[PDB]
Design a protein around this ligand. Structure first.
Ligand code: BYN
Ligand code: BYN
Ligand code: K
Ligand code: K
Ligand code: K
Ligand code: K
Ligand code: MN
Ligand code: MN
Lengths: 500, 500
């Protein structure tokens, strides 16, 4: 099976790419696996495959860390991401985001039901598993539980059967047969939970699939629109219908090659302690436990020699930056274009801990609008911050055509030099805030409202007659024939490879 | 003579450090020298010494580019700066800034007058030079003139003789015997010019010395207090009295080993076209010529085989970032401590294009003040933004004890995650602004007022009971014995030098 359609094939692809280290000696799931993974993420090293987990029993489980993290070289920086999508490993960020947006103007390709697949190779009923006995990792030293769920896909369906959502949301082991996790607005798992709660008749049929098709975990991490079934979007994106098999104890459908599948229910009434968790902005507040949603597990099915993917998230750079930030940015690009705003490109700079999105403006288009910074800031911020795709993002930075939004150094340059503090910004206090950001949920103001800003790093003439500066840099402040002469004589004179 | 006391010795020190490239083939001062220098600055390469300048006549002149720029390795990153001050080349930023502040609580060491020195080896009178015939560089393609003055020291004295100031301010050739340049408030050259203008009797006696003692050019770049003679400050800092020789045509005194000396007058009445210039924020606005101050040159004296230092300034990283930003930060640290604020460290992040200063707070001290973010922001901003040492700085970022302000990644992390936009900031509109920043002088609001902000990246409990988080990073989220185990097994497992 292809790497983008089968997680086991994806692991082999990373091996073959010399982007994997197989660790075959015993590693403790209590902190050690995650500490190695954290080190990998902080240094852009090879992904670790832990083949010998202390406490693995009857095939459950190996761990792959850092599945969507960065590579060290510039040339294949995003190569792990590319391998989720059948793209060349030297793909740029723009190419990866365009692949994830491509299905937005295509008919869905609904999934294909097959009678079995590798995820049915083994099963454990209600009397045969205990989630507290599996080698679930403790990811950070102060975490409030063992976070089994950092890179699986929650599967829930609307009561009327018309929408089946696939998403990533964290969950931890509560007891032998229950998890607790985050289910918060405006996320689709929460929106669907609310529909079940309003109907009031039963708990939500649920499945959690780990080691799913890499293209499916990417869509799981992307804010595609309300009511759109991720399976059909991924089918469109990849050009192929995804093969799904029915759960044994409910009527949901899971990827046939899922490594591990939990089947059960998401309660419409019960809660349980959840968190704290070391999270995407780089923090853990020890002892900050709150009540989260509660899931009951009725059945586990799994592949022979099952592998659980794990994100050891926190400070730069891991899946919470490369996937959450970038895929929100992509959806924000599209949303702005659909609202007739002249946005060409969007990216969440890693240096902002993916709390900012830089929006590259087609300033020829802007000039024809004959508008002003105040008006334009307001319009952009009303579109993005009143939509779900803006949820996680607290600062939008508008930049002109000379800035590459995929390069955080240039975004930082433009923000620092072109946006006058106060005057060139509009604050938004009556929008949904992201409470996970420390300055929200642990800050001075309301955890769930406000704290957002549009910062205009367009210069005045970009609205009127055109750019009226040149950069004071080697590229822009010297003529071409001089530049080339300097480059050609560089090593001759005494001064000091693209792949490496 | 020691490197920190003699520019010629400094050049030799860079050679010996393998931090120089001597270019002995012909290089054009029209753009080529500066383009090589710009490339060096953008890549942290070795400093270029142009020994064969097209148009050099009778010893005037060789050029040394990038005299205070960065080195490529992390271990001796600031080594060129260290060599201005007799510090080891592996000196940290904190050590360099502490050396520049050290004379602030020492008695001055006034200079020593000697009868001659190397700067008198050659001279040209009123009938023998023409500034338009010297190999003055064109630094950027759209510059409004040939900027002879990017790394010399202007020397002016108060009318009453009590204060002699040394400072860097840009100047360009106007004609055969005049320069034009920036002389703007609140800078000391402007403050002294105003005193002469108020007296109204004559033009200001002036000298411009190039290739001065490296320790003197550093103090020239630092906002030491009003009325304090830089020579005596440098004498205190270095522990030695600086040797000065009298000018031939006025009664000012220049460093005895200056490479090149211009003697004349700064007009109290005349102006002339000046700029545009590719400047420290990375921009040039072509055609933006304004009237600047006018200097008359009566005499040139110079060393045999004179070398003119040159800053090819613009985008990161050059002397305008490493010296202007850092030395302002140092003075701001001191100013805050003198006003009883609990600041331990200050640095202008390069990523902000040196428009921000991050202030590290001793949060034990802060807690004992029993204050609030609003009050504390206000107090810090009133102290810094109403002083000259805050002139260039438009954003102050307050951070707690866990942030290393010398590491821009950590400053960016804390600003992005701990400061709520709007709520955690105070805008200052009734302070002096820095008009050179594009969003000031070419922006939407008054070029000379406002546009400043204090951004509080202290968390709420840092004012009350103490830090209540741990970072979700390898250092803070794993116990010590685990960390060391991981590091010790790193290469054994399969994963991947301080000097490199
Ligand atoms: C890639 C990725 C995404 C997320 C998460 C993680 C990773 C690795 C964790 C490591 C598990 C950390 C956790 O904070 N986490 C997470 C989460 N969204 C939540 O509601 N709850 C969460 O606990 N997202 C983001 C969501 O996946 C996206 O916002 C997506 O858009 C949701 O899908 P949908 O509602 O649009 O269908
Ligand atoms: C290191 C350095 C400092 C400065 C400059 C440059 C370099 C390399 C130029 C490349 C020439 C660019 C120019 O923008 N420039 C410059 C300038 N200050 C100005 O009033 N005018 C200027 O044109 N400073 C800053 C000043 O040197 C300091 O602010 C110092 O504090 C002044 O001394 P004082 O008034 O405190 O005595
Ligand atoms: K999704
Ligand atoms: K602006
Ligand atoms: K000075
Ligand atoms: K704050
Ligand atoms: Mn969805
Ligand atoms: Mn001074």
């Amino acid at each position: 099976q292809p790497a983008h359609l089968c997680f086991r094939s994806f692991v082999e692809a990373l091996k073959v790419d010399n982007d994997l280290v197989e660790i075959n000696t015993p590693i403790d799931p209590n902190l050690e696996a995650a500490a190695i993974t954290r080190r990998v993420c902080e240094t852009n090293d090879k992904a670790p495959l832990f083949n010998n987990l202390i406490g693995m029993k009857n095939g459950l489980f190996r761990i792959l860390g850092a599945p969507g993290s960065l590579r060290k070289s510039s040339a294949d920086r995003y190569g792990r991401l590319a391998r989720h999508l059948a793209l060349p490993p030297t793909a740029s960020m723009r190419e990866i985001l365009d692949k994830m947006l491509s299905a937005s103007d295509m008919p869905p390709i609904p999934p294909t039901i097959v009678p079995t697949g590798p995820c049915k190779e083994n099963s454990l009923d209600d009397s045969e598993f205990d989630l507290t006995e599996l080698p679930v990792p403790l990811i950070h030293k102060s975490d409030g539980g063992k976070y089994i769920q950092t890179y699986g896909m929650h599967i829930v369906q609307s009561p009327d059967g018309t929408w089946t959502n696939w998403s990533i949301a964290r969950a931890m082991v509560h007891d032998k047969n229950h998890l607790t996790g985050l289910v918060i607005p405006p996320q689709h798992i929460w929106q669907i939970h609310q529909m079940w709660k309003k109907e009031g008749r039963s708990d939500v049929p649920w499945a959690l699939a780990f080691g799913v098709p890499p293209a499916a975990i990417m869509a799981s991490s992307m804010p595609i629109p309300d009511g759109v079934t991720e399976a059909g979007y991924v089918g469109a994106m990849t050009g192929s219908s995804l093969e799904l098999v029915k759960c044994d104890t409910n009527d949901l459908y899971v990827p046939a090659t899922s490594e591990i599948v939990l089947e059960g229910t998401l309660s419409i009434s019960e809660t349980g302690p959840e968190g704290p968790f070391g999270q995407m902005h780089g923090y853990i507040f020890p002892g900050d436990t709150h009540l989260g949603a509660k899931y009951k597990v009725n059945r586990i099915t799994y592949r022979n020699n099952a592998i659980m993917p794990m994100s050891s998230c926190g400070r730069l750079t891991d899946e919470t930056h490369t996937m959450i930030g970038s895929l929100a940015a992509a959806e924000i690009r599209k949303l702005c274009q659909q609202n007739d705003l002249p946005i060409t490109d969007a990216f969440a700079p890693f240096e902002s801990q993916v709390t900012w999105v830089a929006l590259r403006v087609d300033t020829e288009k802007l000039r024809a609008m004959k508008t002003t910074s105040e008006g334009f800031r307001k319009r952009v911020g009303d579109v993005v911050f009143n939509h779900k795709a803006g949820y996680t993002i607290h600062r939008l930075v508008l930049v002109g055509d000379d800035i590459d939004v995929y390069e955080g150094k240039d975004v930082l340059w433009a923000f620092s030099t072109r946006c006058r503090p106060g005057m060139d910004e509009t604050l938004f206090e009556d929008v949904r805030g992201f409470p996970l950001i420390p300055y929200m949920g642990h800050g001075n103001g309301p955890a769930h409202r406000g704290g957002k800003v549009v910062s205009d790093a367009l210069m005045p003439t970009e609205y009127t007659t055109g750019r009226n500066w040149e950069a004071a840099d080697f590229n822009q402040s010297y003529p071409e024939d001089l530049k080339q002469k300097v480059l050609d004589n560089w090593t001759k004179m005494g001064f000091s490879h693209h792949h490496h």
